[PDB]
């Protein structure tokens, strides 16, 4: 589980671009304030390898 991939982002990337921001994703109108919850998911998921 040391390999991670980003799942949520507001806008697509330009060619050859790198994003390492770990702020809590906002999916609704209410702010997340750095706390997970409804419409508040961690942008990057994990990779299951078995």
């Amino acid at each position, epitope marked *: *589980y040391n390999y991670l991939y980003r799942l949520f982002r507001k806008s697509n990337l330009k060619p050859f671009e790198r994003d390492i921001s770990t702020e809590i994703y906002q999916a609704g109108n209410k702010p997340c304030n750095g*706390v*997970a*919850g*409804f419409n508040c998911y961690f942008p990057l998921r*994990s990779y*299951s390898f*078995r």
Partner: nanobody
Amino acid sequence: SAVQLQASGGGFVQPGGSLRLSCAASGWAETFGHMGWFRQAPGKEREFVSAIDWWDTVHYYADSVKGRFTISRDNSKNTVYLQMNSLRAEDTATYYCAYWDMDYLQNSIPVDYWGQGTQVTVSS
């Protein structure tokens, strides 16, 4: 799969006391994935605490907590409960509600989602 986990309970208690924790799961998943609780201390790694299935058939507790922690599943509101009794100082840490999406839990290694940290402090 899209599972949202909510954790309830926690706070400050005294050694030897009793407490109740709970986790609720919402959304959709691959199957009736099991539900468990982990515990992480400041400066240390996460530790397996408890694991139960979606129909209250398999109970799994860590060796260091065998016969002391209890986990149960409700019948009508989908919320899993973790009954805690006779706490000591080593139980002061942050608990997390862990979900794994498969029918049979060979090991606790495959984790797909986590839960909000619930602080449980045991002190005089």
